Amino acid sequence: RMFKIEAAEIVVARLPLKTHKVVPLLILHGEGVQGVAEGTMEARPMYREETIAGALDLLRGTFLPAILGQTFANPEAVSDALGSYRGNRMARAMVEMAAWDLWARTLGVPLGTLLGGHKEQVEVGVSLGIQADEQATVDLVRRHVEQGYRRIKLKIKPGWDVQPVRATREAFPDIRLTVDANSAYTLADAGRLRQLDEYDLTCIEQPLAWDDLVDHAELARRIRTPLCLDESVASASDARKALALGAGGVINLKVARVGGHAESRRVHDVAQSFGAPVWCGGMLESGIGRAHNIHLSTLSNFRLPGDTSSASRYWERDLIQEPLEAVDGLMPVPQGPGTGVTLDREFLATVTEAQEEHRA
Amino acid sequence: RMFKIEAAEIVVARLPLKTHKVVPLLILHGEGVQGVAEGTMEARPMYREETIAGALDLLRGTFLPAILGQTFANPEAVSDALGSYRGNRMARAMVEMAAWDLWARTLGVPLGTLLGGHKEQVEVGVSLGIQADEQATVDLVRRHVEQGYRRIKLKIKPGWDVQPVRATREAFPDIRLTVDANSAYTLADAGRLRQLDEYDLTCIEQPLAWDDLVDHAELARRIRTPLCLDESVASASDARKALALGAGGVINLKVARVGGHAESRRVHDVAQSFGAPVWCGGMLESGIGRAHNIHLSTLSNFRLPGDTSSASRYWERDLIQEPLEAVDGLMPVPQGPGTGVTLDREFLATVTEAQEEHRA
Amino acid sequence: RMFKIEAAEIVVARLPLKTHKVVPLLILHGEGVQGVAEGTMEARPMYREETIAGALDLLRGTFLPAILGQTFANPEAVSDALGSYRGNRMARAMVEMAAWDLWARTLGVPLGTLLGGHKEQVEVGVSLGIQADEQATVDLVRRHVEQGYRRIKLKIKPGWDVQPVRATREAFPDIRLTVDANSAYTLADAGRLRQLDEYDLTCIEQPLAWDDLVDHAELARRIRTPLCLDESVASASDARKALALGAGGVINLKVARVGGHAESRRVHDVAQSFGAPVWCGGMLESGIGRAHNIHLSTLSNFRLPGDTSSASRYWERDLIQEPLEAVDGLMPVPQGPGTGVTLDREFLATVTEAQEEHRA
Amino acid sequence: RMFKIEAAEIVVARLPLKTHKVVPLLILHGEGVQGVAEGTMEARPMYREETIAGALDLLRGTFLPAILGQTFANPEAVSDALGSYRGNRMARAMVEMAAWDLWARTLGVPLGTLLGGHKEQVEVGVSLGIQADEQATVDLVRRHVEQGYRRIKLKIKPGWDVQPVRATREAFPDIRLTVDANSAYTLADAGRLRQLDEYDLTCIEQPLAWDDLVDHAELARRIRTPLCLDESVASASDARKALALGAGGVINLKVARVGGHAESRRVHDVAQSFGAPVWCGGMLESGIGRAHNIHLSTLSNFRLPGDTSSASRYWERDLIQEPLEAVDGLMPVPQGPGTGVTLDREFLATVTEAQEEHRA
């Protein structure tokens, strides 16, 4: 049957790193269960355009009143009931993704299952920041290869790319290796990035502007290493436009950046229809976000290891009662309905900057 | 939660037209409920390449053995379990679509709801065959426009095309009007087809070879009326390819032709990502197939009316208890879990020409 | 010479329409003069992605702190000083545009003059909403053509487009006529839009998604009426990309949408280098925003009339002392340094809903 | 306020090299200040098409009478008051650039500032003529690298290209290195220039015809080293056409060749909008020209070192009172209003071939 949304809480928590990450949570209540979801927007607009002040005002002033008290058939009907407003996909994702968790919980079904996935474990990789030299780079890869991560991703920048990559591929001729070019290059760097070709990178991630496809397409003609799009694919139509333009052959898919699970599955499916793989990206999420990610990642076109590594890697103590730990580069799907994870309300209370309840 | 398929029945009915149409039914038994689906392949290969003989043989000799006694999380796992066989998409669709029905009934949710649709009714048009003349054409169109159908599809051929279109368009300058060109043309006829342009057809459906994309793309550059693809799109990647090529601006989506609901969802999603609409096509289904179609038609990119009109247009007595009648061009979604319709067992027995049961 | 920004005021006004429109003002204090600019972001994201909540938070928590107490050679140095934040171009524009005003008043030169414009007056048209019928449409158009406005923009939708255009064009066969298609169409409607071609519209404005370039380019190849881009061009490189793609032949340039005057100059220059004209769009500004717009409109590639008509069309009482009235489709450039207009402080106080002051 | 142009002097000086360079100067007088500028045309048409006899006749017979006695808002209004005449951009630049110097001086503002730049130092590189062999080439680079020039440019010709480049890159694996192909090659040399690719040149400058883009585009497809355009970009629309054609990815921007500062900023901005850098080129200018160049070069898309090296390198004694000397490859922006440099009228008098004064 249909679900009624009775109440909503916005909880903003400041979780200690391992200084702090501000974790914005939306909890939707109805049918005697509750769905939970995590904002990935930051206080300032650094990774992308949205902000917490902006997203929270939109939630409490526009999205929650649109849905509070209304009865819905599915999560897609919740999205559609917002619908008119422009951009702000992370903010909408908070509502859409909590609706998915709720929906699934009223049915007793794991989230991944409802989205059509059927993996029990998902493969995971690790992202390495810039290290001080070649051997420091190689020694850190060596460790991660040893813990059995299944893809290695290196941050690179102009002046520091060919070197860490050469040194890494020399030591590790067979590993799945990618780089994060982090929007730091221009077309003038084409001959420099082309030097990466001989090292057989799975891909180079978002080398040019965060909101561009056209130039990425031109770059992709000038070097043989595939391009991966991150910030510049924020919808299924973006993915369609990207792949048809040759802007890339790989997508770093982040569920919240694109609007939530429905639209993510759409991006996933559009990519598969070009035979391009996706992987599930990370945003330093708390157990709430991490768990949504793992559930999404059970879909079949997630054919490259995702950035959902062990929570112990980020937090001394997580917001959820369950530990999300990868072993040998496989992260198990948390058993249970919906996300299969559960807030630790008392621990949460110790780290809550602010909370509010909304009703109809 | 998870479901175990215990038994399967193949039941072939011969249903008299208002001489006859063969209806191959698959019934899957699991978890105290059942799933039912209808084959759309014919005795002979006239609409496409599959046949009843071959499809049934493939069900009993390969697909059923692969699933009987097995346990599954979702219809996706079912399809996954069928192996890497080539083609035979309508055969696969019988199992896939029955599994969706079964799955959804284990959960007590309507099928459409689980596919992401939230429409409570869907818009329908009708397809008229060739009339003896312009006036007979207009007459027949008139009866239907007076029934409130929201699209009229006229069959055409050389050199019976501009006439029935011009006659019709003159009498009804506002109605949504398509033609079905029945793969009866070539690139040589482009000039003739271009003459349709001034009559504001929504599209010309599949005028060239049934399995072609490339010539269609060439034809689309020569005339202004959008083309609509049918036989040519049997999967989400065919859809991708069609639309990237410019082979069509519209797809006629037939759930069983593409392998079933999940793949249909994807086709529909790939279209929408190109800004191409779909509609739900028909294959003279009994109420089983028809209920399946109606559910699928609730997804939001079915923005053009479906070939999904009234049961009583085709059959004095349908195989289900529920009436599926459209009023004023609107088909209501049949209520209840899964497909919302129920076999009339007694009546079905009177028209059964074969049946078998398979177990683990 | 160089200028030091000492203080900043954010003053939010609620100005009654001739119910209301919120006007966020930024006032920068330096070197004995002040600079004033008006935000064009709304309470909610309806025209675009930014919101008042998010923009103000970004001003007080990031942009103002970055500038207060600092010394600058030009508005360019100011923008440069704001960091690499993503998006939020209207927020940036408040600071950028206030800095231009401040800068120009330290020099005693009119703003337009410093941007390279030398026109003493600019041409303006108006935008009409949807009328109940053809005759009401013509009527409303008639009142404006009799005011001497040099372009008439009609809002359109399916299926209210060809009628008001044909009605209007029949009554006024000579007037410059555009439509605003309000992102309410898809590639499917191309045939419908093509029917506008024979009515010699100067352009069709943004008929597809608000953030799209690629589909627009495809649509432009299907119809002869130029397309004009609005929401889709938020910077000089977007403009480059739009025009290289063939996404439009005309850009509707909104100074704040692109991040301010310098970037507007550049957008205008990039257009002109492709032989594409621009015009100055509007966002229901008070006299502050409107004066900013008029100044910018003096540059030589604003070759099509701007959405910049009379203050008294919108407000019984504007926030500035000076009248900004157009006669016969000509808006005179308001005299004096910077923007040439002056806040009516007493009146502003009566409509102020918030204010804060920031210092070093 | 506006400026009135009262008088103009044309002074032609023969400055001793270090036999002579003919230096044509225009001095515009008004508002009690004066703006000065330097012709870059030569007695004969060698670098480009204009000549001194031609340009001076145009100045005294057409441009000065157009502007003498007239009052203007800005330099752009001065350009526009010429406007009808075709080509002759260096001649127009003399008027346009002196107007900029004047304008800025009536305001008390450095020229670069008014054009929106805010660098205090600009980076500089050195151009090397053809040397007799590899080591003579390497020994001269070594010197310049040591004086800390930030880019090295080698003249090359057929028969002498791969060799000096190989020998240079061997000795200097990391330096920013370019070549001047000086319009001396043809498409038949494509395989030969392709041999430069492995040496990671920042670019190859104007390899084919001085007035061509189309062939340069074809060449750019055949080799991986980027092309830089010099003579063939004489306007903002040229730059737009060049970059959109793939004729090059870099522009050698010479202020006078393109018409002066406004149009230069336009070329600068068009390039930036393709993410292509420009640099400021040289013409053996006297302190007058050199100073205009340095002021222009403070703009942000001048991201490659310019050819404005130390004046002591060219003249035993310069026309201006101020020394323009680069130290460690940084050239400081001369402080002061306008160009920040000042004629030495008495020294000038010693080297004047001819002078004239014009009034209204």
Q: Least CA distance to A212: which residue of chain C?
A: C238
Question: Catalytic site residue C157?
Answer: no
A304, A252 Cβ separation under 8 angstroms: no
Give CA–CA dist C179/C188, Å, rounded: 18
Residues in chain D: 360
Q: Please, which residues bridge with residue C199 across strands?
A: none
D208, D216 Cβ separation under 8 angstroms: yes
Show me where the domains of chain D are located: 1-108+339-360, 109-338
D212: phi > 0 → left, psi -120 to 50 → alpha, else beta; which?
A: beta
Q: Which of C21, C119, C155, C241 is catalytic?
A: C155
CB-based contact D276 A194, cutoff 8 Å: no
Chain A meets chain D (3+ C-beta pairs below 8 A): yes
C66, C83 Cβ separation under 8 angstroms: yes
Give CA–CA dist A334/A57, Å, rounded: 32
CB-based contact C43 A58, cutoff 8 Å: no
CA of C25: how far to CAs of A49, C357, D261, in Å? Answer: 22, 12, 34
Among A160, A218, A223, A224, which would you mutate to test the D interface (most chain D Cβ atoms within 10 Å of its Cβ)? A218
Nearest to A240 among B113, B262, B273 (CB): B273
Residues of B with CB under 8 A from a CB of A: 1, 72-77, 80, 107-110, 113-114, 116-118, 236-237, 239-240, 244, 262, 265-266, 269-270, 272-275, 300
- With b meaning 16 or more CB within 10 Å and e meaning fewer, what string describes D170-203? ebeeebbbbbbbbbbbeeebeeebeebeebbbbb
Strand bridging mode D227-229 / D203-205:
parallel
CB-based contact D226 A191, cutoff 8 Å: yes
Give the gap in angstroms from C-alpha D60 to the nearest C-alpha of chain A: 44
CB-based contact B109 A107, cutoff 8 Å: yes
Chain A residues with beta carbon closer than 8 angstroms to that of D223: none
Among C187, C195, C216, which would you mutate to test the B interface (most chain B Cβ atoms within 10 Å of its Cβ)? C187
CB-based contact C187 B225, cutoff 8 Å: no
Give the gap in angstroms from C-alpha B337 to the nearest C-alpha of chain C: 34
- Gaps after which residues in chain A, C–N over 2.5 Å? 18
Q: Please, which residues bridge with residue B7 across strands?
A: B29, B359
B1-108+339-360, what's its fold?
Answer: Enolase-like; domain 1 (3.30.390)
C338, C113 Cβ separation under 8 angstroms: no
Look at the block and give the residue holding tokens 């088909």.
B331
CB-based contact C270 D273, cutoff 8 Å: yes
User: Which residue, D290, D273, D304, D131, is CA-closest to D205?
Assistant: D304
Task: Note the Cα D184 to chain centre separation in Å.
Answer: 21
Chains touching D (3+ CB pairs < 8 Å): A, C
Chain A meets chain B (3+ C-beta pairs below 8 A): yes
Give CA–CA dist D106/D124, Å, rounded: 30
The torsion angles phi and psi of C31, rounded to 5 degrees, stand at: 60, 35
D179, D152 Cβ separation under 8 angstroms: no
User: Does the domain spanning D109-338 belong to CATH 3.20.20.120?
Assistant: yes
Give the gap in angstroms from C-alpha D150 to the nearest C-alpha of chain A: 16
Task: Note the Cα D243 to chain centre separation in Å.
Answer: 20
CB-based contact B270 A269, cutoff 8 Å: yes
Q: Tokens for B270, please give them.
A: 């790939």
Give CA–CA dist D269/D283, Å, rounded: 22
Q: Please, which residues bridge with residue A330 across strands?
A: A123, A327
Strands (E) located in B19-130 = 20-30, 33-38, 71-72, 121-123, 126-128
The torsion angles phi and psi of C349, rounded to 5 degrees, stand at: -60, -40
Q: Where are the alpha helices (DSSP H) in chain A?
A: 52-58, 64-67, 75-80, 89-107, 111-115, 134-146, 162-171, 190-194, 214-222, 236-245, 261-273, 287-296, 345-350
Q: Is A132 exposed, middle or buried (0-12, 13-18, 19+ CB in 10 A)?
A: exposed
User: Which residue, C239, C189, C190, is CA-closest to C213?
Assistant: C239
Chain A residues with beta carbon closer than 8 angstroms to that of C209: 237
CA of D26: how far to CAs of B18, C123, D340, in Å? Answer: 97, 37, 17
CB-based contact B224 C187, cutoff 8 Å: no
Chains touching B (3+ CB pairs < 8 Å): A, C
Write the single-letter amino acid at B285.
Answer: E
Question: Both ends of chain D: CA-CA distance in Å?
Answer: 21
Chain C residues with beta carbon closer than 8 angstroms to that of B248: none
CB-based contact C47 A88, cutoff 8 Å: no
Chain A residues with beta carbon closer than 8 angstroms to that of B73: 110, 113, 118
- With b meaning 16 or more CB within 10 Å and e meaning fewer, what string describes B144-178? bbeeebbbbbbbbeeebbbebbbbbbebeeebbbb
Strand bridging mode A352-359 / B3-4:
unpaired
Nearest to A45 among C47, C86, C209 (CB): C86
Q: Which of C18, C119, C157, C254 is catalytic?
A: C254
Residues of C with CB under 8 A from a CB of A: 43-51, 53-55, 57-58, 61-62, 85-88, 209-212, 214, 237, 241, 244-245
CB-based contact B76 A239, cutoff 8 Å: no
Chain B residues with beta carbon closer than 8 angstroms to that of C191: 200, 224-226
CB-based contact B224 C194, cutoff 8 Å: yes
Give CA–CA dist C27/C104, Å, rounded: 14
A48, C86 Cβ separation under 8 angstroms: yes
Among C186, C195, C216, C218, which would you mutate to test the B interface (most chain B Cβ atoms within 10 Å of its Cβ)? C186
Give the gap in angstroms from C-alpha B127 to the nearest C-alpha of chain A: 31
Write the single-letter amino acid at A321.
Answer: Q
A111, A275 Cβ separation under 8 angstroms: no
CB-based contact C188 B249, cutoff 8 Å: yes
Give the gap in angstroms from C-alpha A169 to the nearest C-alpha of chain D: 22
Residues in chain A: 360
CB atoms within 10 A of CB B69: 11
Is C235 assigned a ligand-binding role in the annotation?
Answer: no
Question: Catalytic site residue B157?
Answer: no
Question: CA neighbours within 13 Å on the CB side: how many for A174?
Answer: 1
Nearest to D273 among C116, C239, C275 (CB): C239
Contacts of residue C101, defined as CB under 8 A and 6 or more positions apart, other chains included, come to: C28, C34, C35, C36, C37, C111, C292, C338, C339
Q: Tokens for B312, please give them.
A: 């009583």
* One-character DSSP codes across C139-208: HHHHHHHTTT-S-EEEE-BTTBSHHHHHHHHHH-SSS-EEEE-TT---GGGHHHHHTTGGG--SEEE--S
Look at the block and give the residue holding tokens 């205008």.
C268
* Largest distance between two CA atoms of chain C: 61
Nearest to A80 among B72, B109, B118 (CB): B118
Strand bridging mode C250-253 / C227-229:
parallel
D176, D125 Cβ separation under 8 angstroms: yes
Q: Least CA distance to A186: which residue of chain D?
A: D275
CB atoms within 10 A of CB C173: 10
Residues in chain B: 360
Nearest to B237 among A76, A108, A273 (CB): A273
Give CA–CA dist B247/B243, Å, rounded: 6
Give the gap in angstroms from C-alpha C194 to the nearest C-alpha of chain B: 10
Asked how this structure was determined, the answer is X-ray
Chain D meets chain B (3+ C-beta pairs below 8 A): no
